[PDB]
Design a protein around this ligand. Sequence first.
Ligand SMILES: [Ca+2]
Ligand SMILES: [Ca+2]
Ligand SMILES: [Ca+2]
Ligand SMILES: [Ca+2]
Ligand SMILES: [Ca+2]
Ligand SMILES: [Ca+2]
Ligand SMILES: [Ca+2]
Ligand SMILES: [Ca+2]
Ligand SMILES: [Ca+2]
Ligand SMILES: [Ca+2]
Ligand SMILES: [Ca+2]
Ligand SMILES: [Ca+2]
Ligand SMILES: [Ca+2]
Ligand SMILES: [Ca+2]
Ligand SMILES: [Ca+2]
Ligand SMILES: [Ca+2]
Lengths: 424, 424, 424, 424
Amino acid sequence: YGTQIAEITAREILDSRGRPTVEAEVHLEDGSVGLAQVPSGASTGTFEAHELRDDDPSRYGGKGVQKAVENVSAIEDALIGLSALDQEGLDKAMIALDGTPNKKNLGANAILAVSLATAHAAATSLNLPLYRYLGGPLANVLPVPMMNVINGGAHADNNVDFQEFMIMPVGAPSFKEALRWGAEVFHALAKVLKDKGLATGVGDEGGFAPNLGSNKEALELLLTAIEAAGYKPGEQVALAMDVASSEFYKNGLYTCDGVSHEPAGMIGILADLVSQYPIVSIEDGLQEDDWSNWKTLTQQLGSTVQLVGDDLFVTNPDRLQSGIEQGVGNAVLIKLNQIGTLTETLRTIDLATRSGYRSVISHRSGETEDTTIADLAVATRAGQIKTGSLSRSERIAKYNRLLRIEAALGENALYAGAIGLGPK
Amino acid sequence: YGTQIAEITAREILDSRGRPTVEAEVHLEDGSVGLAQVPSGASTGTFEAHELRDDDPSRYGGKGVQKAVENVSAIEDALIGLSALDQEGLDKAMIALDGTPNKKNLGANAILAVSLATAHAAATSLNLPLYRYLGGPLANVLPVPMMNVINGGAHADNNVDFQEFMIMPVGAPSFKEALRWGAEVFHALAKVLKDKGLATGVGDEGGFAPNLGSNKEALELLLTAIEAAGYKPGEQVALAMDVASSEFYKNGLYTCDGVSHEPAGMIGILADLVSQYPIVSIEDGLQEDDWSNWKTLTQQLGSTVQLVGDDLFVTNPDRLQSGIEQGVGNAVLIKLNQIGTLTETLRTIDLATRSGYRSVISHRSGETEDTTIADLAVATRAGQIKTGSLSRSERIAKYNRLLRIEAALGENALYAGAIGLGPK
Amino acid sequence: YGTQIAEITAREILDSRGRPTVEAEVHLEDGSVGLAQVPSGASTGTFEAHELRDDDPSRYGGKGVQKAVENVSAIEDALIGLSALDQEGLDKAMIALDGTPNKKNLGANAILAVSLATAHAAATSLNLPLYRYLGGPLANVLPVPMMNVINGGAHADNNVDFQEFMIMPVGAPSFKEALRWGAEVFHALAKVLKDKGLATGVGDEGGFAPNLGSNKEALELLLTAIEAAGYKPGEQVALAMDVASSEFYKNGLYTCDGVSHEPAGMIGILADLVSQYPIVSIEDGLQEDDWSNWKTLTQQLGSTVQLVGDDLFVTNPDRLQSGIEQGVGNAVLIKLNQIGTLTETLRTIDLATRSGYRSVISHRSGETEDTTIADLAVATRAGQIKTGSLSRSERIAKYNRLLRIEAALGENALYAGAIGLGPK
Amino acid sequence: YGTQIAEITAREILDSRGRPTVEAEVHLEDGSVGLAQVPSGASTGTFEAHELRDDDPSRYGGKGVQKAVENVSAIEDALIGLSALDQEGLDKAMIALDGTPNKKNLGANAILAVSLATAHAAATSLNLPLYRYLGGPLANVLPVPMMNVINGGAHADNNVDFQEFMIMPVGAPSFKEALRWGAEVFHALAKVLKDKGLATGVGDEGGFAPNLGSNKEALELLLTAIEAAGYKPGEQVALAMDVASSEFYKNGLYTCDGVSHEPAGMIGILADLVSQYPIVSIEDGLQEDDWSNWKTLTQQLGSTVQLVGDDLFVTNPDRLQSGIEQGVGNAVLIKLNQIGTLTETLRTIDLATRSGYRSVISHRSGETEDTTIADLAVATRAGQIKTGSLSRSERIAKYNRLLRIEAALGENALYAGAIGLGPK
Ligand SMILES: [Ca+2]
Ligand SMILES: [Ca+2]
Ligand SMILES: [Ca+2]
Ligand SMILES: [Ca+2]
Ligand SMILES: [Ca+2]
Ligand SMILES: [Ca+2]
Ligand SMILES: [Ca+2]
Ligand SMILES: [Ca+2]
Ligand SMILES: [Ca+2]
Ligand SMILES: [Ca+2]
Ligand SMILES: [Ca+2]
Ligand SMILES: [Ca+2]
Ligand SMILES: [Ca+2]
Ligand SMILES: [Ca+2]
Ligand SMILES: [Ca+2]
Ligand SMILES: [Ca+2]
């Protein structure tokens, strides 16, 4: 009786950008409480779960989530009495209650909040940490963090075309050391920016967006930072990029460093960059619908560098399955609130894993104090996590959770970067 | 037996600025776990508790806290077996174990981590929320938030002399509405900055530090933002300032807007500002040791505006007691890690309260996902909290906790701004 | 305290062939009991865990396991007090206690018995079925059974060169239906043998070994049986083979149907067979050390048919990792007692899964009433199990366990054959 | 309240021959679960309980048990709320619910499955092993096993007229040693068959059915096997036979070794065999209805050899009572599913015991992984069990249970063969 759902509550809280989002609280008959918060999503997109916004222009600029919060009342009616242990039954019950493919009815934000809060409730009921609850006794791999430090494209006011430049401490012996390497490189980077008179205000993810002139300037900055912190680029701290090519793709052409390129040109740009720079991963190097050219990119660089689909796959098992069939990418970003249940997320990670694709567990721009993605990364042995820079506690709280997990695993703790489960 | 301490653990985590800090975990014989994290402090200052840094230049730029974390082992030896309910006994036991006035030996960061983790453990043991555990059945007052939005002085690269400009939703019917008013003003402010081509990268506290020319420009910006969001300055959303005058005080002179002033000049500047602008509070308007001139400032503006000591008092009961005796200030910033135990913090709030001074429960620059100061504010009916802007979840998590508290108090929930426990 | 190991006992029992083996019984402080039995292994082989036999010629023809049973006393000394939940810690503790690479000291049979009995104890402690304990909330896939029906080579007295001919109900909607299809084909086969005056006594695995003249005769018999039971060969019931080529390989030559072949000849034989017959899988088609020719076989048939390494890999993560690197096989037989702990078995299945190899969970010739491999198959979503024919309850008990698992998963039950996790 | 029946479930599983049978699962209010499986029975016979088959020719060749499984739903309605401790009340409730003498309505297979599952549930509730639950504190006697090794008559394709030839380790000091003697004789027998070029495929019970010419050849084979294993025939390992004379009885005549005999001839054949060979027991030596001649056989050999009724009595208390009255046999085979409840089985064993008849607890041809008959043998101090050869785990699992029972009884363990409760 004890694991049966007794109560499900939701309220409107704020994310890390000061915008409404949903949290849910699940009480079991044995007194177990699970609390989960949902990050910022999208209300739009063919292959993405739709979060429900109120669109009331006189509240929170129409970004209220009173309707999603009210819909949790209808989920409570449907789920009261079910075992919290039956995650798949619970998730299927909410999918059917919603009855729409993109969860437009109840809201993805309502459904995911209950989906995670149930899982937290159930792990507390069994007195298991969430990573062990979800992953069983081999859930022992700390991910290589891909750590935001420089922003461009739509995430900046500068002449950098690519969206995110990241460091990855691939060479560290432990997550605890990997995190310290990240932080020291981030503080060395701050000092270099100050010394060059560049702005050191941070953006959504806790990284810098100084007024730089090119993608090259960004990569050169990260190399200076790594070396000033005393680490070896590539061997110890490698580079990664979110190209978000969709942002600068118009009519079969990609505009990059003032010039227009055909797919074959953009591919060549990416190939020159991985030649010149210790880049171990590239996300959305080509546009979300440029599949024939994605196939060439994968054929050419796929065995030498990670090729992450984000907008390419939108955590959608049909798009990922198509990618797998066509030799497109070798890695996929996993966003819980892009698909909308824990079950469907785990199915999508399993599909990636079985096909030799790497799963990169990802934050959203609008994050919360929730640390679920840390446990999700360890549960699935994903080997990588993307949860922002080395400032802002909606980013830092995931690393602190990973430190607690690594300590608790003790002598069983493995670091992905040391056992071949990293990007390279 | 159940509330007796069974285990006390600590580890090195990261704060919101990517710098090491301490968290402690307290296990009771009944299985109750309390976890607390400590914000960034100071290793220096006569009247402040000293946090212990490792000063190992090859780790975290010498800001490691391995020694503080190890000292928690010596606290566990001292406290194992004591009831977690006896907060004062526990806090006195750590003070004696340290045996130094400024907690230099064990570290303030080690002592406060155990002090809070014990209190969280004890409230969980009794199944009470922390605010009720600490404050008893009248702990029912949601504080007026003083919300960072514009930064100057040592917290910016601009020509603004004052350190912090804040909004305070004094006129809201509830904390839930007060928080929405704050967020809408913050998003209107962002839009005004973008439209004027000013930088919108955020600093430590989640506010903006655009290149403005004067304190006046800052105040005019907040008024535009308030009005653009559709609120009435003063009646609905009032202004507050952290002058941090210590930063621009040299030899009995205060340099402010290009000119040098004698105390009487600086006082006059403050008096003109509260005349022209709906400023309901001023922090560190005069230097931390300028007591005769503090007495004049208090005599002149004290009955018309809140005068907050921060550097003036450093949460120190002797300095506060001196202030009370001399008619200096009418409000005090309360920083847990400036004094170093929960007991001594509560004594200092009681001393302020009994003497008609307002307590403003304060964050630090280096914050964590910890939400203790939200419960501390409600427990003591402090009526005000200062926990940063409307972005970064080390700030936002305190407001989300206050939303959970307000919901749980239900029909017993009171907002300080509506019942005369605010700044004005 | 409750999951802590209180007692570990072992005794000498009999396997399905009337030969000694080990069972272990683990008691937890909360009264949870786990019991496991180990199947027949080998005392020999470079890359295999060594089971410990007594070699006392006056007992059980020297196949006694009194020494392995006594060694469990030394494991109890090492493990008493450890949480049964910490499977990896427990397994590593026994590996270190043994201190030999092939577990020659304590015995693989002693170590695996405690390894499984601990896992059963822990799942009972948490009140979870073993598949859910090991696999988490997505452990919902019933495997396609590869069902022994005709034996040749070293497992018969006949002129059939290949060792095992199997049916696989790939086309069934459920494991419950798949099992019925298997049983009906097996009873139709028995009738065909009786009607042709061929022997219907069964061997170790519960299949037939009639005096047939060729591999072709075996395949033609299974096709008659399938059709007489009213099923469609390939679409509904497909064929699989254990070639065990090591048995008829001498000096770079394979003797098959009276003729000697070079690797390229044997490959051609296999290619003609998959052309003529609905064969969806081939095990040990080439010799255990014939790696260059394995590479050709995989290159030629790998995308059209499953190529299972058994003697090729001996459930050894180094041999499997080599195979993966060299494009050798696309599937691996998983034998718990070939590696000797549950942890190392799960690591080996994870390694196969991540590299796009299929895991086939396998019985041994000497089996017991233990049903662990059924739960192991569902826990890891392996998608295939090889646990003998449709007679002898050491084989049938695994299918009865799979029926209990499918019933308990309810609407969440998936059949590997219907969702693309089968051989084809 | 705790021993009250909360739930009774059944499902269709497979027996050791790949044919459907029933298992039932009984849950008590205290969480106790009992699971039992039923062996193959008969749907026909005047004095036998009728198992219910579906007779649907398109499923399992009409041997489905969906109807029996559904009838367990009607038993659950009748029994929910009754104490599982009240075995007799439960068994009488099912007998009345069925309302037919041969349990044709619900099915013997449905009724016995619930009857055993209840008893297992109740013993688990009291934390007693089943033998102690049923037999009280003197349940301490391990039976002499009668172990199948050679088959003839309707159970073979050969010229052996008698149906079963068995060894019985009457001279062993313990069941643990008795089992080893059995296994060593069985492995010596296998070797003799291989060396003579005779088939070593096994039948239903895990024994051999080589193409032998006579009953004499069978007896001579067992003597060679016993001696080759190094044991003394008679003193250490004795012989037993299932004549199943009904199979070769037509019109007052018994055809045996090519000749027709009158009852007095068949009796003489049996008398010569016990003269020449160390035969300690004979089952169905004369036809199931040949009572006057059974009386002569018993008068002549009864004080020198065990005379077991199987088809003679069909575990029926009226036929056994008639036998007792007429001096027919001195032993009875006990088959749970021939009578259909545990209560009626125990009544029938009590009736045999009180009248000086030996009870031989018997398997069926279609057996399962269930081990109830091992506990039944020890509970009733029956002193003999007939549960097949030394291969196939539906046979071996009963011996493994007897090993667990003997270990658990410790210094209180008695072997029937050593204390005069055996066949001789
Ligand atoms: Ca529990
Ligand atoms: Ca730009
Ligand atoms: Ca992206
Ligand atoms: Ca270590
Ligand atoms: Ca309590
Ligand atoms: Ca300045
Ligand atoms: Ca200040
Ligand atoms: Ca109200
Ligand atoms: Ca438990
Ligand atoms: Ca042969
Ligand atoms: Ca094989
Ligand atoms: Ca269904
Ligand atoms: Ca009890
Ligand atoms: Ca015959
Ligand atoms: Ca018989
Ligand atoms: Ca003894």
